[PDB]
UniProtKB/Swiss-Prot annotation, chain B:
Protein name: E3 ubiquitin-protein ligase XIAP
Effect of P49R: In XLP2; uncertain significance
Underlying gene: XIAP
S-nitrosocysteine modifications at: C17
Protein localization: Cytoplasm; Nucleus
Residues making up the signal peptide according to the UniProt record: none
Domain of life of the native organism: Eukaryota
Required for ubiquitination and subsequent degradation of BCL2 during apoptosis: annotated span: 17-64
Range within the parent protein: 434 to 497 of 497
UniProt function note: Multi-functional protein which regulates not only caspases and apoptosis, but also modulates inflammatory signaling and immunity, copper homeostasis, mitogenic kinase signaling, cell proliferation, as well as cell invasion and metastasis. Acts as a direct caspase inhibitor. Directly bind to the active site pocket of CASP3 and CASP7 and obstructs substrate entry. Inactivates CASP9 by keeping it in a monomeric, inactive state.
Similarity-based family: Belongs to the IAP family.
Impact upon substituting H34A: Loss of E3 ubiquitin-protein ligase activity
Disease tied to this protein: Lymphoproliferative syndrome, X-linked, 2: A rare immunodeficiency characterized by extreme susceptibility to infection with Epstein-Barr virus (EBV). Symptoms include severe or fatal mononucleosis, acquired hypogammaglobulinemia, pancytopenia and malignant lymphoma.
Tissues in which the UniProt entry reports expression: Expressed in colonic crypts (at protein level). Ubiquitous, except peripheral blood leukocytes.
Length: 62, 64
């Protein structure tokens, strides 16, 4: 409910779901999930969230 | 950015389509990688409205 806690929550959402250090920076084609930072995207050939095979790793910019 | 409040506001707003600001980004542009528009707003553009790079694909993304 508090501002700080809402904030902590959104920050935590932005984090790579594999290393949880760096922010997400890659979108998986073709499933379209935002899952990993750039480094961690080197370790995966299938989306961790939906297991779709990744045909391409697009770099993103907000 | 200068207070927890503005930090919150920014993280909340950056989810929003940058054109209409009425709904979440739902498209990433290939090849530039800009996250700019909801599905509706991406319909009209053939170049990214941020960097003007020709768009070869509008990839749907899941952002909540
Ligand atoms: Ni509005
Ligand atoms: Zn990572
Ligand atoms: Zn996926
Ligand atoms: Zn829009
Ligand atoms: Zn662009």
């Amino acid at each position: 409910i508090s501002t700080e806690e809402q904030l902590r929550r959104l920050q935590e959402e932005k984090l790579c779901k594999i290393c949880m250090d760096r922010n997400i920076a890659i979108v998986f084609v073709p499933c379209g999930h935002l899952v990993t930072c750039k480094q961690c995207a080197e370790a995966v050939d299938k989306c961790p969230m939906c297991y779709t095979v990744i045909t391409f790793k697009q770099k993103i910019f907000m």
